[PDB]
Every structure is written in structure tokens, then in C-alpha cells.
């Protein structure tokens, strides 16, 4: 009936910021109920967030109300989430579904998010340089 798409997973260091988001497609947000869960290596998922149309009453998993923020666009099908104060716990598969109840079906594709310290390697050998070239 509905199904959801979620992505834009990155790699940041404990203590960072990480924009992800789901481009839903069957409904609309300022309408029905959403929420963004995680699921880290096998675990069994687990709802993160939770955002409700109208008035703006949210609710997390209670461990994640000062970790993470779940919002979304009343005209725009996307469901966003900031990923900060990070602890080795975010490292892991993100999805956003609606609420039907009390729990996540989660039909989004996976958003491979992960946490690690000193990655700021990309191979260049060529200097990066800055803005002293623009060719």
C-alpha cells in the first residue's frame, strides 16, 4: 500500500552531524503519522523518533529525545532527521514508516549511517588546495 525510500547515511566522528532523510510517496506528512527507526548490526529495529501533523506533539525512545531530531516538510513527502551527540550508538541502518499503533513496520530501503574516530582520508596526492585555482 505505502512504501518509503531512506538514505543519505554518512560517515561522522562521536560528537558530529549527520543529515539524513526518506522520501515517502503514498500520503501526506502534515497528515499522517511518521517516525524514523534504527536498526544496528541484526538488532530488530528500533523506533527512534515519532512526529505528529497539526500541533507538532513528538516523542522519541526516550534515549534518543536529546540525541536526535525528527522533522519533516508539510509539503514535500521527505521525513529529515539530525543526527548529533553521537556515541558509537547511531552507527547503524536508519528507516522512516508511519504509526499505526505503537510500533514501526519500516518500508524504507536502509540508510547506512556509521560513527568512527580519524577517517578524514580520501586519496588525493595532488593537493587540495583551497581557492588558489579555478582553472
Not at 560528537?15 to 515517502?24: E, Q, Y
Not at 523518533?49 to 500541533?55: E, H, L
Not at 536526535?68 to 509539503?75: M, P, Y
Not at 574516530?117 to 587540495?128: A, H, P, R
Request: charged share 15%.
Amino acid at each position: 500500500d505505502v512504501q518509503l525510500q531512506a538514505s543519505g547515511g554518512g560517515l561522522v566522528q562521536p560528537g558530529g552531524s549527520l543529515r539524513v532523510s526518506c522520501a515517502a510517496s503514498g500520503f501526506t506528512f502534515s497528515s499522517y503519522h511518521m517516525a524514523w527507526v534504527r536498526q544496528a548490526p541484526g538488532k530488530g529495529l528500533e523506533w527512534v523518533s515519532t512526529i505528529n501533523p497539526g500541533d507538532g506533539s513528538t516523542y522519541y525512545a526516550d534515549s534518543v529525545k536529546g540525541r536526535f531530531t525528527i522533522s519533516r516538510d508539510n509539503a514535500k513527502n521527505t521525513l529529515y532527521l539530525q543526527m548529533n551527540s553521537l556515541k558509537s550508538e547511531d552507527t547503524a541502518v536508519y528507516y522512516c514508516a508511519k504509526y499505526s499503533g505503537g510500533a514501526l513496520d519500516a518500508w524504507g530501503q536502509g540508510t547506512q549511517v556509521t560513527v568512527s574516530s580519524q577517517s578524514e582520508q580520501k586519496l588525493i596526492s595532488e593537493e587540495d588546495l583551497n581557492h588558489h585555482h579555478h582553472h
